[PDB]
């Protein structure tokens, strides 16, 4: 809506009084100068058709640890620690997917280092949404089993690393000066002399509640989730997030990768779609069990299909 910057010095102070110190907020962080309208732009979740995940007896009964990190469970996969950046778009719905989809061709797909093309997804799946104006994860994963996608090497993500800092700590260009539209849907690699390879999943499903999450994450690896972004989330720096003050900004899609506790506080470790500069090095930690901002209300995942025989 407005061009009014979202972060106040007073706003933040308030927030830091109400969180009890549980999680640090920052007013002069990487996000102070950010526009109200620029913020809602990053929240790409708009609008289950997916079968709910049924756990086998064997899975259902397994004693899940108090702490679990996906990058540790599968040390041999480089796609897990890698943080994504959706630039200046509502790509989160798509980015968050390809991310988990890349991660899952490992944990399950038998291919180690394959970055699924979030751009390809973002531009060709039409029932998913309006592209860079909002999307629906459930369908993202459906199109992965339905149509299938291409590697990042074939069809790279078209928007550059964008920073919300006048002077970036990694020297990216500022976000303020970007306004991206849904790219064109292409059917050959951006370099036509690169053969087009198609990666589909052979099934997709949906997750709900605290336990489905851990249990599915444990066996199959990171997947896609969404939650409500309030103004306080923007000023997130560290510690375990939970909503205390702020206007609604929209549903935002992220990638789940772990869980633990911090001083008696159960949390989810989540990989974000905004830089390595934001939060805990692109990461952030929300509150497990509350279902904070609805983060446990709906998940999305699938099993990738190993290429060839
Ligand atoms: C599908 O392939 C086409 C191949 O060009 C891609 O469209 C092009 O995307 C590039 C990179 O985002 C755009 O570059 C921009 O060009 C303008 C000049 O018009 C400039 O202002 C920017 O600084 C930037 O260099 C380009 O405009 C755009 N061209 C067309 C015809 O759409 C598209 O991104 C590919 N889509 C996917 C999903 O891979
Ligand atoms: C937000 O904007 C402020 C000021 O509008 C920026 O602070 C200035 O940074 C410039 C370099 O870009 C310095 O020369 C000045 O020392 C600062 N001036 C003032 C008045 O603060 C700041 O870079 C921006 N903040 C972030 C986090 O990007």
Author numbering: 26 to 72, 78 to 339
Authors' text:
The crystal structure of Trypanosoma brucei procathepsin B (TbCatB) in complex with its native propeptide represents the first novel bioinformation obtained by applying the SFX approach at a free-electron laser. This enzyme is of scientific and medical interest, since the knockout of its encoding gene has been shown to be lethal to the parasite that causes sleeping sickness in Africa, which turns TbCatB into an urgently required potential new drug target. TbCatB crystals grew spontaneously within living baculovirus-infected insect cells during protein overexpression to a size of 10–15 µm in the longest dimension.
By combining diffraction data from 80 Trypanosoma brucei procathepsin B crystals with an average volume of 9 µm3, a complete data set to 3.0 Å resolution has been assembled. Diffraction experiments were conducted on the P14 microfocus beamline at the PETRA III storage ring (DESY, Hamburg) with a 4 × 5 µm (FWHM) microfocus beam, a total photon flux of 1.2 × 1012 photons s−1 at the sample position and a photon energy of 10.00 keV. To collect a complete data set, we employed a data-collection strategy in which a region of interest of 600 × 600 µm was raster scanned with rotation exposures. After iterative merging and scaling, 109 661 reflection intensities in the resolution range from 88 to 3.0 Å were merged into a final data set consisting of 8881 merged reflection intensities with an overall completeness of 99.8%. This final set of reflection intensities included data from 426 diffraction patterns collected from 80 individual TbCatB crystals in 120 groups. During stepwise model building and refinement, 62 propeptide residues and five carbohydrate residues were manually placed in difference electron-density maps. No electron density is observed for nine flexible amino-acid side chains mainly located within a loop region spanning residues His195–Asn209 or for ten atoms of the carbohydrate structures. The superposition of the peptide backbone atoms of both structures revealed a high degree of consistency, resulting in an average r.m.s.d. value of 0.35 ± 0.19 Å, which is comparable to the overall coordinate error of 0.32 Å estimated based on maximum likelihood by REFMAC5.5. Main-chain deviations of more than 0.8 Å are limited to nine residues located at the N-terminus and C-­terminus, in flexible loop regions and at positions flanking the disordered part of the propeptide region that results from an increased flexibility of the residues after proteolytic cleavage between Ser78 and Ile79. Despite the overall similarity in atomic coordinates, systematic differences were observed in the relative heights of the electron-density peaks at the 12 Cys SG atoms involved in disulfide bridges.
